[PDB]
Design an enzyme around this catalytic site. Structure first.
Site, PDB file in Angstrom:
ATOM      1  N   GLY A 145       2.480  48.039 -14.996  1.00 25.63           N
ATOM      2  CA  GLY A 145       2.106  46.768 -15.610  1.00 25.63           C
ATOM      3  C   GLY A 145       1.042  46.863 -16.688  1.00 25.63           C
ATOM      4  N   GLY A 190      -2.113  44.092 -18.640  1.00 20.89           N
ATOM      5  CA  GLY A 190      -2.833  42.820 -18.665  1.00 20.89           C
ATOM      6  C   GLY A 190      -3.389  42.659 -20.059  1.00 20.89           C
ATOM      7  N   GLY A 191      -4.493  41.930 -20.174  1.00 18.53           N
ATOM      8  CA  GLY A 191      -5.210  41.828 -21.435  1.00 18.53           C
ATOM      9  C   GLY A 191      -5.941  43.139 -21.615  1.00 18.53           C
ATOM     10  N   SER A 222      -6.164  45.593 -19.368  1.00 23.83           N
ATOM     11  CA  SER A 222      -5.820  46.605 -18.368  1.00 23.83           C
ATOM     12  C   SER A 222      -4.357  47.047 -18.299  1.00 23.83           C
ATOM     13  CB  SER A 222      -6.293  46.141 -16.980  1.00 23.83           C
ATOM     14  OG  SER A 222      -5.538  45.050 -16.517  1.00 23.83           O
ATOM     15  N   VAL A 256      -1.623  49.495 -15.500  1.00 23.92           N
ATOM     16  CA  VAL A 256      -1.441  50.079 -14.183  1.00 23.92           C
ATOM     17  C   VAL A 256      -0.343  51.125 -14.294  1.00 23.92           C
ATOM     18  CG1 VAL A 256      -1.071  49.646 -11.752  1.00 23.92           C
ATOM     19  CG2 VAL A 256      -2.000  47.830 -13.206  1.00 23.92           C
ATOM     20  N   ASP A 299      -3.257  30.858  -7.825  1.00 24.12           N
ATOM     21  CA  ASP A 299      -2.089  31.120  -8.615  1.00 24.12           C
ATOM     22  C   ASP A 299      -1.139  32.085  -7.919  1.00 24.12           C
ATOM     23  OD1 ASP A 299      -0.833  30.487 -11.143  1.00 24.12           O
ATOM     24  OD2 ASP A 299      -1.056  32.625 -11.611  1.00 24.12           O
TER      25      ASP A 299
HETATM   26  O1  LIG Z   1      -4.457  45.292 -10.166  1.00 20.50           O
HETATM   27  C1  LIG Z   1      -4.092  45.266  -8.995  1.00 20.50           C
HETATM   28  N1  LIG Z   1      -4.784  44.661  -8.035  1.00 20.50           N
HETATM   29  C2  LIG Z   1      -6.053  43.978  -8.320  1.00 20.50           C
HETATM   30  C3  LIG Z   1      -7.067  44.005  -7.170  1.00 20.50           C
HETATM   31  C4  LIG Z   1      -7.251  44.924  -8.386  1.00 20.50           C
HETATM   32  C5  LIG Z   1      -2.805  45.974  -8.579  1.00 20.50           C
HETATM   33  C6  LIG Z   1      -1.728  46.002  -9.457  1.00 20.50           C
HETATM   34  C7  LIG Z   1      -0.557  46.662  -9.084  1.00 20.50           C
HETATM   35  C8  LIG Z   1      -0.441  47.293  -7.845  1.00 20.50           C
HETATM   36  C9  LIG Z   1       0.734  47.966  -7.477  1.00 20.50           C
HETATM   37  C10 LIG Z   1       0.847  49.061  -6.720  1.00 20.50           C
HETATM   38  N2  LIG Z   1       2.135  49.396  -6.612  1.00 20.50           N
HETATM   39  C11 LIG Z   1       2.878  48.522  -7.300  1.00 20.50           C
HETATM   40  C12 LIG Z   1       4.255  48.401  -7.528  1.00 20.50           C
HETATM   41  N3  LIG Z   1       5.098  49.282  -6.991  1.00 20.50           N
HETATM   42  C13 LIG Z   1       6.528  49.338  -7.362  1.00 20.50           C
HETATM   43  C14 LIG Z   1       6.752  50.060  -8.702  1.00 20.50           C
HETATM   44  C15 LIG Z   1       7.027  49.534  -9.905  1.00 20.50           C
HETATM   45  C16 LIG Z   1       7.172  50.450 -10.888  1.00 20.50           C
HETATM   46  C17 LIG Z   1       7.024  51.741 -10.530  1.00 20.50           C
HETATM   47  S1  LIG Z   1       6.688  51.745  -8.875  1.00 20.50           S
HETATM   48  N4  LIG Z   1       4.727  47.388  -8.284  1.00 20.50           N
HETATM   49  C18 LIG Z   1       3.929  46.482  -8.840  1.00 20.50           C
HETATM   50  C19 LIG Z   1       2.549  46.550  -8.655  1.00 20.50           C
HETATM   51  N5  LIG Z   1       2.017  47.593  -7.875  1.00 20.50           N
HETATM   52  C20 LIG Z   1      -1.529  47.265  -6.971  1.00 20.50           C
HETATM   53  C21 LIG Z   1      -2.696  46.614  -7.346  1.00 20.50           C
END
Ligand SMILES: O=C(NC1CC1)c1ccc(-c2cnc3c(NCc4cccs4)nccn23)cc1
Ligand SMILES: [Cl-]
Length: 259
Positions: A17, A19-20, A22, A24, A132
């Site tokens: 993913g 963000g603005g 950030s 991942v 949200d």
């Molecule tokens: O930013 C996050 N959490 C905020 C408290 C800090 C965040 C973002 C993404 C994930 C996360 C962790 N794992 C995933 C995931 N896993 C499936 C996949 C998608 C694409 C490749 S693997 N899909 C979407 C999001 N995932 C965990 C925390």
């Protein structure tokens, strides 16, 4: 492409993913294990987005102890220029998973509902209202759903959906309370039972927001085998938050208790 967090090296596999501030990444460590690393560029960040990121990492740390329905944080690095958070990598997010199912097993639906209630209950007990919630905020890990964020910092995008948006969030345009999260949860559960969100048919965003806060717009609740499920949905989707069911009442409801 390589990432270093606290001197430990990770190989990027793909971008999960953005963000603005950030991004991942699904990532590979030295011992051949998969993680998700969030990177936040703080170089162009006002005090507001800086403090939201500090608040997020503080709450994510605090909540490690209190529920395993919150995403695991293994390590993090913070500096004036950047944040890295090394977190667990999920199988798939709820939104993508719902999108590919024609129907949902009643038992699987109930079990995911319990996971969601617990996770949201645990953030509420620490004074956090997400405000949200939507399927993209939950992640499947070990056949269990985990909440991945807290609504504190700007959230991950793989125009915006407003199908899960609570009435009193629309009215802030602060009446947002824990009951706001109950509404959003109800909308997810509604999708999981009837195959659509409650106002999915209303295409125009503005028309939809009007419908969400209009008490004369009846939401449909077709009769289904599970009478307890139908009552949960009706109690979650009451437009007066005072009358809307609470998280503790949902935790004691027949739907989650009578098995
Ligand atoms: O930013 C996050 N959490 C905020 C408290 C800090 C965040 C973002 C993404 C994930 C996360 C962790 N794992 C995933 C995931 N896993 C499936 C996949 C998608 C694409 C490749 S693997 N899909 C979407 C999001 N995932 C965990 C925390
Ligand atoms: Cl690690």
């Amino acid at each position: 492409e390589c990432i270093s967090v606290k001197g430990r090296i990770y190989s990027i596999l793909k971008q999960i993913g953005s963000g603005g501030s950030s991004k991942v990444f699904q990532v590979l460590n030295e011992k051949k294990q998969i993680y998700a690393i969030k990177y936040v560029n703080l170089e162009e960040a006002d005090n507001q987005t800086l403090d939201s990121y500090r608040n997020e990492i503080a709450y994510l740390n605090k909540l490690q102890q209190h529920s395993d329905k919150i995403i695991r944080l293994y390590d993090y690095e913070i500096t004036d220029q950047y944040i890295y958070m090394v977190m667990e990598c999920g199988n798939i997010d709820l939104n993508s998973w719902l999108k590919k199912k024609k129907s949902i097993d009643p038992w699987e639906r109930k079990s995911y509902w319990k996971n969601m209630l617990e996770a949201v209950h645990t953030i509420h007990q620490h004074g956090i209202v997400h405000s949200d919630l939507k399927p993209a905020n939950f992640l499947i890990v070990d056949g269990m759903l985990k909440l991945i964020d807290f609504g504190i910092a700007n959230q991950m995008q793989p125009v915006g959906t407003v199908n899960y948006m609570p009435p009193e969030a629309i009215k802030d345009m602060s009446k947002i309370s824990p009951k706001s999260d109950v509404w959003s949860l109800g909308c997810i559960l509604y999708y999981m039972t009837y195959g659509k969100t409650p106002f999915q048919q209303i295409i125009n965003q503005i028309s939809k927001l009007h419908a969400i806060i209009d008490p004369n717009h009846e939401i449909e609740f077709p009769d289904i085998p599970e009478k307890d499920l139908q009552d949960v949905l009706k109690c979650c989707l009451k437009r007066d938050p005072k009358q809307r069911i609470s998280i503790p009442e949902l935790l004691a409801h027949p739907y989650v208790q009578i098995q």
